[PDB]
Design a protein around this ligand. Structure first.
Ligand SMILES: C=C1C[C@]23C[C@@]1(O)CC[C@H]2[C@@]12C=C[C@H](O)[C@@](C)(C(=O)O1)[C@H]2[C@@H]3C(=O)O
Length: 152
């Protein structure tokens, strides 16, 4: 069964600037903020609303070298986006289901709360173990990098 792991971070960024990047501009911004991981991102189907499929190609060092992602939720009223791995990425590392959902809310004019929900399940017959503690840490690192990018 799918479990949910919640964490959060607060970033010194403006809510709508962060929402733009997390929900839309991540196509150009992701390789710029994670240049040691991500080579490029391409929209394969859809234009950025729900149902949109994207491929992330990682640097050739990296393994797995790609993930195919689907936008499964896009709520601009509540600033919530859900992004599901449908192939590759953690699904090549022992996880049977993986989704990341970001919900933003204002703390101040230039401070924003990011609630991060990781939805996941494992297949126990695969020996490699990857915990949502570990995967959440990667997501937070990405957020902190995004913070630095928006604040220069
Ligand atoms: C360091 C990370 C964090 C990634 C996976 C990665 O290994 C590299 C790509 C990051 C990411 C970038 C944008 C999206 O917010 C995310 C859910 C995704 O699909 O890809 C993000 C995704 C995630 O947060 O799990």
């Amino acid at each position: 069964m799918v479990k949910e792991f919640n964490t959060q971070t607060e970033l010194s960024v403006r809510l709508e600037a962060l929402w733009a990047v997390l929900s839309k501009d991540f196509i150009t911004v992701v390789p710029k903020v994670l240049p040691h991981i991500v080579k490029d991102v391409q929209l394969i189907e859809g234009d950025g609303g729900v149902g949109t499929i994207l491929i992330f190609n990682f640097l050739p060092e990296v393994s797995p070298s790609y993930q195919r992602e689907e936008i499964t939720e896009f709520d601009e009223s509540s600033h919530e986006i859900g992004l599901q791995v449908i192939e590759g990425g953690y699904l090549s590392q022992g996880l049977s289901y993986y989704k990341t959902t970001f919900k933003l809310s204002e703390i101040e004019e230039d401070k924003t709360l990011v609630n991060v929900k990781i939805s996941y399940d494992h297949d126990s017959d695969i020996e490699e173990k990857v915990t949502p503690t570990k995967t959440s840490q990667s997501t937070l690192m990405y957020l902190r990098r995004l913070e630095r990018y928006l604040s220069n």
